[PDB]
Amino acid sequence: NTASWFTALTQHGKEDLKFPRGQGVPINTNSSPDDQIGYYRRATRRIRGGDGKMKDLSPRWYFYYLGTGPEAGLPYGANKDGIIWVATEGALNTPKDHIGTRNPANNAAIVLQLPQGTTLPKGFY
Numbered sequence: 001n002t003a004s005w006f007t008a009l010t011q012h013g014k015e016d017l018k019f020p021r022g023q024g025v026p027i028n029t030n031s032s033p034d035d036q037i038g039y040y041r042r043a044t045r046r047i048r049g050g051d052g053k054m055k056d057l058s059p060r061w062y063f064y065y066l067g068t069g070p071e072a073g074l075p076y077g078a079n080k081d082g083i084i085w086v087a088t089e090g091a092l093n094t095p096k097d098h099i100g101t102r103n104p105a106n107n108a109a110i111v112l113q114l115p116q117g118t119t120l121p122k123g124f125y
Contacts, residue, residue: 002101004069006112008060009040013123016042017061017084020119024086026063027113035096036088037076038065044082061124063112067095 006026011017017040025036040061049055062069063086066076076093077085102109114120 001103003104004062004064004109005099005102006063006110008043008062009112009120009124011042011059011061011124015121015123017124018121019084019086022087022089023118024114025088025091026110027115028110031065031096031099033088033090034092034094035065035099037086037091037093038063038068038096039071039074039076039083039085040064041070042082064101065096065099066093067097068099068101 005028009017024040025038040063043060043062045057045059046054047057061084064071071080071083072095074080074083076087
């Protein structure tokens with residue numbers, strides 16, 4: 001029933017999502033500098049293509065604060081396929097249960113915006 005607090009980043013290439021150190025956490029004026037830590041989770045989508053076989057669509061990457069989302073129990077830095085970690089300089093390695101996930105019935109998604117000088121990888125928008 002719950003979802004990410006932000007809209008997705010679309011992957012148009014083969015390479016997975018990877019940000020430089022200290023970059024990647026979306027802007028959120030309601031969160032504090034301590035809370036600037038989390039991960040992006042890939043959501044693969046497939047449809048009945050124009051021919052007759054299942055064609056894959058461009059995957060989407062959704063941000064979730066540390067200790068929240070479908071991988072709430074994973075610690076920061078854990079190695080898992082479809083999960084890449086991000087953190088701003090000075091963020092605490094603690095779960096963000098106080099922020100939690102978004103319930104779509106009461107709240108719309110925040111438009112994902114990255115701070116000034118952020119280097120998005122090739123094929124990510």
